[PDB]
């Protein structure tokens, strides 16, 4: 490769070959006039060093330098290592027809579609635009097609729309971790230079919007396109391939809107009346003659799948609210009503979505999830929660508690200085009393935030759940946990020191009143420890997962049944405390070897070549089986692979 000017930049291999050829020529010329033994031995030694430097530098002795201070590379050092061919060009390689930009949100699309810039879509689909133009006849040749694409008058936009309506793309993230990393969506021509992905898949990607870069790839062959529509679709990979929890998880804004919806109160505007249906309920809520959450007996009408596929309609009355009825209007067909009568928390809505999926199916389930997202965002926009400095309340007993804490600390210090106890027990007493005071402050502030605000009941007083912003945000499972709200409101307790121990002088104040420089420096180092070790932790995790995926790859299901009666004896794993993994989640979907009999007196339950599912799990739970002899992948005896009978149900299906 040349450089700036007529001079050409030398290469490592070129220099090594030049040195070897020069040494060979010198040896051949010197072995003509009968050169002495010392000179020919020195020449042979130099030629040996030259050929060693050409083959493999750094292994034998020192590494010869081809520059000022950088060690020269050889064929062995270029092939092996991190920058080798196997890791730089064979497996990992650069591809075309791809883009990258900053993502946004755009909460106005369905699930099997995402956002993508208009100019980027025109640039990525240039061959498709050329083909469509040449098949329509509006272009003369490739030069005319290039001129039309670079001019952009009016036909190119509709041609791009035509090719976008029926061409899914595959977005891509750089740090992929699990299987769900490259999905399939449908672009929409949106002005701008950013990507508008669905907010529900962000929690699945463990992604955010802090200027992150996302890549996109577009298939261009019919088999890969069909494979994408069958497997890579977000409306197909709902169930997670690890456990049984699906991937469509309601986001924090959605769960906050639903929690504000189904939050019943003791008195509101229009409490103590009856109405016909949720239709009139939402009408009255929009008119303003009735509150959003008010106890009103509304007649409901649902269906049930008690028959063999046929649904039975029924009509009854239930004492509920208005928001609950409005949320019930978007329910699909066959679901009970006792699922929208509680507070509808994060685990509650997760269980409800899982139950709706497993009872009805897939397409109405994803439609219901999209509708839930829409209605949650809409009601969040309608209400809007706001955190206030007055909404955050400091307990009035925190001063007295910390005063008693300092008094006990001073008493222990004086008793230790007087010559009674040792520094070890003094430090133990200090840490335990400080932990006790921190836990007391935390529980006090939790009780305050959970029942601070009260309302009337058309005549007297009544205590209920507090209508505080932080309390709602902590109870709906949106953002923040118990320790999180503790750190936000009250004392953070003690925190460890870099060596491994913990500081005997904890934090006195919280974040609202005022910390000192000393406590700030303590928290600084306590957080910097983690902020420094997380990088090496991620590096070690990446190395471990690479080693695992490299050591366990050659295994393809080649047969259906091997015809063996071996496996692992399933026993309930118990570690000191209680049952960790339940038997249902343990043998959920796995064909057993022999005929598993009922634990009764010689009663056959399930056969030996059948798939186990939820019904069989319920039967096993009713029969109370201790251990179930099921097959195992390591117990399977299949030549070059593992049969499908020694695995059971496929995950994510």
């Amino acid at each position: 490769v040349p450089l700036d000017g007529g001079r050409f930049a030398t290469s490592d291999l070129n220099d090594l070959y030049r040195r070897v050829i020069n040494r060979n020529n010198r040896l051949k010329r010197l072995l003509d006039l009968a050169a002495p033994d010392i000179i020919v031995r020195n020449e042979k030694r130099m030629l040996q060093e030259a050929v060693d430097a050409l083959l493999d530098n750094g292994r034998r002795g020192r590494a010869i330098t081809g520059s000022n201070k950088r060690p020269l590379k050889s064929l062995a050092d270029m092939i092996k290592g991190k920058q080798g061919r196997f890791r730089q060009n064979l497996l990992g390689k650069r591809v075309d027809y791809s883009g990258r930009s900053v993502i946004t949100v755009g909460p106005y699309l369905r699930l099997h579609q995402c956002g993508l810039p208009k100019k980027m879509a025109l640039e990525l689909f240039k061959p498709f635009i050329y083909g469509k133009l040449e098949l329509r006849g509006l272009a003369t040749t490739i030069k005319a097609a290039k001129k039309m694409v670079e001019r952009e008058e009016a036909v190119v936009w509709d041609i791009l729309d035509e090719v976008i309506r029926e061409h899914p793309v595959l977005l891509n993230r750089a740090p992929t971790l699990h299987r769900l990393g490259i999905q399939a969506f449908e672009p929409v021509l949106i002005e701008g230079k950013a990507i508008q992905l669905h907010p529900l898949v962000c929690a699945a990607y463990n992604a955010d919007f802090d200027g992150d870069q996302m890549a996109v790839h577009v298939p261009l062959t019919l088999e890969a396109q069909l494979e994408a529509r069958a497997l890579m679709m977000s409306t197909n990979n709902i169930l997670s391939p690890a456990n049984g929890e699906p991937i469509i998880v309601p986001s924090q804004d959605v769960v906050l809107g639903l929690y504000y919806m189904t939050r019943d109160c003791v008195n509101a505007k229009g409490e103590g009346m009856v109405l016909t249906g949720p239709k009139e309920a939402e009408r009255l809520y929009r008119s303003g003659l009735a509150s959003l959450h008010a106890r009103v007996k509304v007649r409901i009408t649902e269906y049930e799948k008690d028959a063999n596929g046929e649904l039975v309609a029924k009509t009854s009355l239930k004492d509920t609210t208005v928001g609950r009825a409005i949320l019930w209007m978007i329910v699909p067909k066959g679901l009970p009503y006792s699922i929208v009568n509680q507070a509808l928390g994060k685990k509650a809505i997760s269980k409800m979505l899982n139950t709706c999926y497993r009872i009805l199916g897939l397409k109405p389930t994803v439609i219901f999830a999209d509708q839930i997202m829409y209605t949650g965002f809409a009601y969040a926009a309608r209400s809007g929660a706001s955190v206030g400095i007055d909404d955050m309340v400091i307990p009035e007993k925190k001063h007295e508690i910390i005063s008693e804490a300092e008094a006990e600390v001073a008493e222990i210090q004086e008793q230790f200085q007087s010559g009674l106890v040792t520094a070890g027990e003094r430090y133990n007493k200090v840490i335990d009393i400080w932990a006790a005071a921190n836990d007391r402050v935390s529980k006090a502030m939790m009780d305050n935030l959970q029942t601070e605000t009260v309302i009337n009941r058309d005549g007297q007083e009544e205590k209920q759940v507090s209508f505080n912003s932080i309390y709602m945000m902590a109870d709906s499972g949106a953002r923040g946990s118990a320790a999180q709200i503790r750190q936000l409101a009250g004392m953070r307790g003690l925190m460890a020191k870099p060596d491994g121990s913990i500081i005997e002088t904890p934090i006195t104040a919280n974040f609202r009143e005022g910390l000192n420089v000393l406590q700030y420096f303590i928290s600084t180092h306590g957080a910097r420890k983690g902020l420094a070790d997380t990088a090496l932790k991620t590096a070690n995790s990446g190395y471990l997962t690479r080693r695992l995926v490299d050591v366990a790859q050659d295994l393809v299901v080649t047969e259906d049944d091997c015809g063996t009666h071996e496996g692992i004896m399933m026993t309930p794993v118990i570690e000191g405390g209680d049952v960790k993994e339940p038997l249902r989640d343990r043998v959920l979907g796995r064909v057993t070897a022999e005929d598993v009999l009922k634990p009764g007196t010689a009663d056959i339950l399930v056969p030996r070549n059948t798939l186990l599912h939820e019904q069989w799990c319920d039967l096993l739970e009713e029969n109370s089986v201790d251990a179930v002899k099921v097959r195992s992948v390591v117990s399977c005896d299949t030549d070059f692979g593992v049969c499908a009978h020694c695995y059971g149900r496929d995950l994510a299906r």
Binding site: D4, L90, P107, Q252, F467, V517, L531
Partner: protein, 1319 residues
């Protein structure tokens, strides 16, 4: 009492702790480092003089010549900063050193004959540092970062963790000099002492101790203790010491004076020890086995036959006992062994040692340092004496000797600079004592054991290395000289020194690239500390102790403004009040505290001194005269803090802002945010971008004025006076009569740099801030640079904030903006992209710059001229030709503007090398530079001569004044008037000769400028001319950019919201910025709501004042309102008196504060909730600050009130059009048939192994095969697929991987046979 220029905008400040020490110059570290680097200080003393006085005295082998040195001077640089950076030359000054060479005659000790004295010889051109602390290498601007490394001396580690799975703790010593070989005193689990040179292999220590001119008996008597034996008729007595037996347990019988004290199996305790000291009987009875277990030291022969009885360092036995009993000896010196007092490590080492003589020891040393070489005795002796007792290859420093003496517990801190036998003995004794149990070790993460470097010390070390490298050739040429007929400049050499200093100042791991896109970033990078350069640690060979901050990081290293990525914890910063110690430590100021009165006198304490005394906390309640109101106060003693009393304290912190840095100091309410959140906030404030209007902040810390003054981005007036002519290009300051010097008193001219480009493609502009006819003081702000306003660093802007979810547009942490922001044009930043043009002279002639280019277009040539260069001020877009270039074949090779940056050409510079005929365009361009230079010089001469005539007429006015001879005769004849020949006449004559020399300097400078413009500059050997064009792209807010704040919260704009859709209050004012309340529990920023409330109070006060000023009210009401607003609060230090102001000053103050009220908030003592509520109650705002709003779509009152307010935000240097990239089909690589990568070059993505594994986990095979074989590897398959797509057919075909082909070809070129077989 305050200043007069500060009356334009006084910032209200809160707080309760009165400050005592002001803020010094933040570039003081670089200034003192450079002054220590270059200085004419005599007697050496760590500098160029010291290096010269240390290395120059060098004699000759046989030349009979000695070259000395007297002093050295410096010359004036050929180019100054401005035009130096404009061209691209290294801003350096010629260094001249005067030397003398003497020559003596043979057969005489020092009989000289004739000596030559070289007058100012050259030895290298070293670059000078400007006032801003920046260096110039090749027209750029780089700052050398200080280095934190290990102090030269002796250290004692433990290396616990890898103890061969034994659990035994080890203690090793590490003697590290300043420049020489190392010395490690390692240990073994088998109780043995070993040494090593340059960390090669394990070697015994007794061999070195003997080679240090010492025998076995002397070594043993010097290290171990003597146990004298005596021989009588019976009961062989032994001299034992209780201090010796305090470790081991004497299991034998002990009796004295006929009384048995210790029997068999009684353990000796403290009472036994005191009884032994009281008896002092060193003549007891010992068993025969203990004598055999003892080790004799010296040799012993027979008393009759004279035969050697026992050898040196060997166990005794019954035969030797009988031999000593039959002899007549009375004194036998023996060693002493113990397990918890003194181990016989030297005894086992000497036993393992096969040698026993110094000659064999030296032979073994020579054989181990260079095998395959005859070990000569003289050569080995010279090698052993040249490693530890030399003055060239081994030398320490003053700080090294001080640390060595401090670790060895000596008395003097000075002395010699090399290692000595006594020092080796002392270090070995200390290591033995540490291994025995007594004495602790020293760690590495402590600040009292490390040492910081500087630019001056590092440059001195590099210069010394180059000089000691060239001294070899100097001495060789001096020895192989002549007979008193040479030349000093011909015998001296300086090319290695020049190359060394050039590579050190250019290519260095510490001398990195500066980022001048922000004054805060500049002032942080000027004090950044990095322990990454040579002499310290790397990036992958680090653990946890070097990453986590040691508790001694108090007021010196800031733990906040630190980066995050590959290297976390290594890159640090420096505190505000932290200074550099005289030895190279890290100093911090501390107020001297008496027994009960806190004196304002400060006292500096180092790292080794802070751990001895107790210092109280900064934020502590105290009286006005410095008296502790409370009894208990939190203090510290050795890093670990605790709680002490009142009469037990010694010192106290100076201020509360010393524990934090200066870049992180611009975060209001740092105590309200978490550590990591404040860290990322300080980082994102460092990487910022100036907006269009530098709007004043409303919740500033208070040090913004000091930061803007200390920075070099503004024009500070040197000597104050009266301003007469204000302009946006030059400022003229007429000084008052107070500051009038009898020689060159003069006017003050300050130039203003216009729109130029910074390092990160950012624009920097200086705007004036003074009025016509206004007095000024010394040290006054006159211009405002980037992100500055009236001397205050104003980075971001001020917006209306509110906190409510809105249709999910703010998902997890997204930011919502309104259309009013983009309508008023207030975040439209200016970016200047650097485009480089190159015109070479290759085959078939050079590349001409003419407009006669075939196959062109009139629409494209209309923007160009008849040369091929666009005019100044034309708006170009993506796809236009800027500078026209053609290559003879003729092929067009002009410079094209990249796609995506619609900028504007504002300046075109052509640098033609001397010797090329210029065309008419270059001629007219040169004429334009000459014209503007002549105009500038003429106007400068005009203003200077106007000042000279004003001065001389003011001198003639004082004394004899004659109006007739002043108005009748012309102005040119003002030399012979009625005036007494005194000091006034002296001033007139000196001003006359000053005007004469100014016109002479004007003529000389005009000639020099003409010569420099006519001549050519220096370029690369192969290029003719170069064109540097600066663009001007107007970047507005576009959906995808990156908004954030001063608390760590991040934001990405999703979609703009109209004014009609944004919510509005009861008055009708919509909100502009809406965040997400869900980001508060995640990222701990409790200070965000406090800043919001403060912004409401400040905006309300400013709007109230503006309304009162607009409705036309008298000055009394405005004065009362301002007085109340400035005196509200509990107890603040800002005490103003409005009764001593004028009506115009109040009118101007109200007019300036009509658009907001700046409120100060120093870091750990800002405003409180009580003051915030009081200000809100004074203003027309509610107490809670949570007002009820109206919906923008429908329009109704919300269920609960929402939080709205004002927040100071800013824009990051990340843009959507700069972070976006896309490619469908382009060029590929050459070595491997794969597409390229990057944005500047038309490249794509990279389908890596992790996503390949993801596709493997998926049930997809054809897609991955298409991605890995068709898109990049198979060129034929890619072309066929592209043809089928453009033809209207959908078929894919596999192919051979070119990467696999390359791999197999390489493995075939190697020594491995692989092939492809066929079935």
């Amino acid at each position: 009492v305050y200043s007069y220029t500060e009356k334009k905008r006084i910032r209200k400040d809160f707080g309760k702790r009165p400050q005592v020490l002001d803020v010094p110059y933040l570039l003081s570290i670089q200034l003192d480092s450079f002054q220590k680097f270059i200085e004419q200080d005599p007697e050496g003393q760590y500098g160029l003089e010291a290096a010269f006085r240390s290395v120059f005295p060098i004699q000759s082998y046989s030349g009979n010549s000695e070259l000395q040195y007297v002093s050295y001077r410096l010359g004036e640089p050929v180019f100054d900063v401005q035009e130096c950076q404009i061209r691209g030359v290294t801003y350096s000054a010629p260094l001249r050193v005067k030397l003398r060479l003497v020559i003596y005659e043979r057969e005489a000790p020092e009989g000289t004959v004739k000596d030559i004295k070289e007058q100012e010889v050259y030895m290298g051109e070293i670059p000078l540092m400007t006032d801003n602390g920046t260096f110039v290498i090749n027209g750029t601007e780089r700052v050398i970062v200080s280095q934190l490394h290990r102090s030269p001396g002796v250290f004692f580690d433990s290396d616990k963790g890898k103890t061969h799975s034994s659990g035994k703790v080890l203690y090793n010593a590490r003697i590290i000099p300043y420049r020489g070989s190392w010395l490690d005193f390692e240990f073994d689990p088998k109780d043995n002492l070993f040494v090593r040179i340059d960390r090669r292999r394990k070697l015994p220590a007794t061999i070195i101790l003997r080679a240090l001119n010492y025998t076995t008996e002397q070594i043993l008597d010097l290290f171990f203790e003597k146990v004298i034996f005596e021989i009588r008729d019976n009961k062989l007595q032994m001299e034992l010491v209780p201090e010796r037996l305090r470790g081991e347990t004497a299991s034998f019988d002990i009796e004295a004076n006929g009384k048995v004290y210790v029997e068999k199996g009684r353990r000796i305790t403290a009472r036994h020890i005191r009884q032994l000291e009281k008896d002092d009987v060193k003549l007891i009875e010992v068993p025969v086995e203990y004598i055999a277990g003892k080790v004799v030291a010296k040799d012993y022969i027979d008393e009759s036959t004279g035969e050697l009885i026992c050898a040196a360092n060997m166990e005794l036995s019954l035969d030797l006992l009988a031999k000593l009993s039959q002899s007549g000896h009375k004194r036998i010196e023996t060693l002493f062994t113990n397990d918890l007092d003194h181990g016989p490590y030297i005894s086992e080492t000497l036993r393992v040692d096969p040698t026993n003589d110094r000659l064999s020891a030296l032979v073994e040393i020579y054989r181990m340092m260079r095998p395959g070489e005859p070990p000569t005795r003289e050569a080995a002796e010279s090698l052993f004496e040249n490693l530890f007792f030399s003055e060239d290859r081994y030398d320490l420093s003053a700080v090294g000797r001080m640390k060595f003496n401090r670790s060895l517990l000596r008395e003097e801190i000075e002395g010699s600079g090399i290692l000595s036998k006594d020092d080796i003995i002392d270090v070995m004794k200390k290591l033995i004592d540490i291994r025995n149990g007594k004495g602790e070790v020293d760690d590495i993460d402590h600040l009292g054991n490390r040492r910081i470097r500087s630019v001056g010390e590092m440059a001195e070390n590099q210069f010394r290395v180059g000089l000691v490298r060239v001294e070899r050739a100097v001495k060789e040429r001096l020895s192989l000289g002549d007979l008193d007929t040479l030349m000093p400049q011909d015998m001296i050499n300086a090319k290695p020194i020049s190359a060394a200093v050039k590579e050190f100042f250019g290519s260095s791991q510490l001398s990195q690239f500066m980022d001048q896109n922000n004054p805060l970033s500049e002032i942080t990078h000027k004090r950044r500390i990095s322990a990454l350069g040579p002499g310290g640690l790397t990036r992958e060979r680090a653990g946890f102790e070097v990453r986590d901050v040691h508790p001694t990081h108090y007021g010196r290293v800031c733990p906040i403004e630190t980066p995050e990525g590959p290297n976390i914890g290594l890159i640090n910063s420096l505190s505000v009040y932290a200074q550099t110690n005289e030895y190279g430590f890290l100093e911090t100021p501390y107020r001297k505290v008496t027994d009960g009165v806190v004196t304002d006198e400060i006292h500096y304490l180092s790292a080794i001194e802070e751990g001895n005394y107790v210092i109280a906390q900064a934020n502590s309640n105290l009286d006005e005269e410095g008296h502790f109101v409370e009894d208990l106060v939190t203090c510290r003693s050795k890093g670990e803090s605790s709680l002490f009393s009142r009469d037990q304290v010694d010192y106290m912190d100076v201020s509360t802002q010393q524990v934090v840095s200066v870049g992180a100091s611009l975060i209001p309410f740092l105590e309200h945010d978490d550590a990591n959140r404040a860290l990322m906030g300080a980082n994102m404030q460092r990487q910022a971008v100036p907006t269009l209007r530098a709007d004043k902040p409303l919740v500033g810390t208070g040090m913004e004025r000091a930061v803007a003054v200390d920075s070099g981005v503004t024009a500070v007036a040197k000597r104050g006076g009266v301003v007469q002519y204000v302009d946006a290009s030059r400022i003229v300051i007429k000084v008052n009569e107070d500051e009038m010097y009898p020689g060159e008193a003069g006017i003050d001219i300050y130039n203003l740099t216009k729109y130029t480009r910074s390092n990160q493609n950012t624009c920097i502009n200086q705007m004036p801030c003074v009025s016509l006819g206004e007095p000024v003081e010394r040290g006054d702000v006159l211009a405002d640079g980037p992100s500055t306003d009236l001397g205050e660093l104003a980075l971001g802007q001020n917006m209306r904030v509110a906190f409510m979810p809105w249709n999910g547009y703010n998902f997890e942490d997204s930011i919502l903006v309104s259309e009013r922001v983009v309508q008023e044009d207030r975040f439209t930043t200016i970016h200047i992209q650097e485009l480089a043009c190159v015109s070479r002279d290759t085959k078939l002639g050079p590349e001409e710059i003419t407009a006669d280019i075939p196959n062109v277009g009139e629409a494209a040539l209309s923007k160009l001229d008849e040369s091929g260069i666009v005019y100044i001020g034309a708006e170009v877009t993506g796809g236009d030709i800027l500078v026209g270039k053609v290559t003879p074949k003729v092929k067009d090779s002009s410079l094209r503007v990249p796609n995506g940056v619609s900028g504007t050409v504002i300046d075109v510079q052509v640098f033609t090398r001397d010797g090329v005929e210029k065309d008419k365009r270059a001629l007219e361009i040169e004429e334009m530079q000459l014209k503007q230079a002549k105009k500038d010089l003429s106007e400068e001469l005009q203003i200077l001569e106007a000042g000279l005539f004003s001065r001389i007429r003011a001198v003639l006015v004082a004394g004899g004044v004659e109006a007739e001879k002043l108005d009748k005769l012309p102005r040119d004849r003002w030399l012979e008037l009625g005036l007494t020949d005194e000091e006034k006449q002296n001033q007139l004559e000196q001003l006359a000769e000053q005007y004469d020399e100014l016109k002479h300097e004007f003529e000389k400078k005009l000639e020099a400028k003409r010569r420099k413009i006519t001549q050519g500059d220096d370029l690369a050997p192969g290029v003719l001319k170069i064109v540097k064009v600066y663009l001007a792209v107007k970047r507005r807010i576009q959906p995808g950019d990156k908004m954030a704040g001063r608390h760590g919260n991040k934001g990405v704009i999703s979609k703009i919201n109209p004014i009609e859709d944004m919510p509005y209050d009861e008055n009708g004012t919509p909100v502009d910025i809406v965040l997400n309340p869900l980001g508060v529990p995640s990222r701990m920023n409790i200070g965000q709501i406090l800043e919001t409330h403060l912004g409401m109070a400040a905006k309300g006060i400013g709007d109230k004042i503006n309304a009162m000023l607009k409705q036309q009210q008298e000055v009394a009401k405005l004065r009362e309102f301002i007085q109340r607003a400035y005196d509200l609060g509990a107890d603040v230090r800002q005490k103003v008196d409005l009764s001593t102001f004028s009506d115009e000053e109040v009118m101007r103050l109200a007019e300036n504060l009509r658009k907001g009220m700046p409120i100060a908030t120093p870091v750990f003592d800002g405003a409180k909730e009580a003051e915030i509520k009081e200000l809100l109650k004074l203003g027309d705002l509610p107490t809670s600050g949570q007002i009820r709003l109206y919906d923008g779509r429908t329009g109704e009152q919300f269920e609960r009130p929402v939080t709205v307010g004002y927040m100071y935000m800013l824009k990051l240097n990340h843009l959507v059009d700069d972070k976006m990239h896309a490619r469908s089909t382009g060029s590929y690589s050459l070595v491997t048939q794969q597409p390229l990568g990057g944005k500047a070059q038309f490249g794509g993505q990279r389908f890596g192994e992790m996503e390949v594994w993801a596709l493997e986990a998926y049930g997809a095979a054809y897609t991955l095969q298409e991605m890995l074989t068709v898109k990049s590897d198979d060129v034929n398959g890619r072309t066929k697929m592209y043809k089928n797509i453009v033809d209207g057919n959908h078929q894919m075909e596999p192919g051979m991987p070119e990467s696999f082909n390359v791999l197999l070809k390489e493995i075939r070129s190697l020594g491995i046979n692989i092939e492809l077989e066929d079935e």
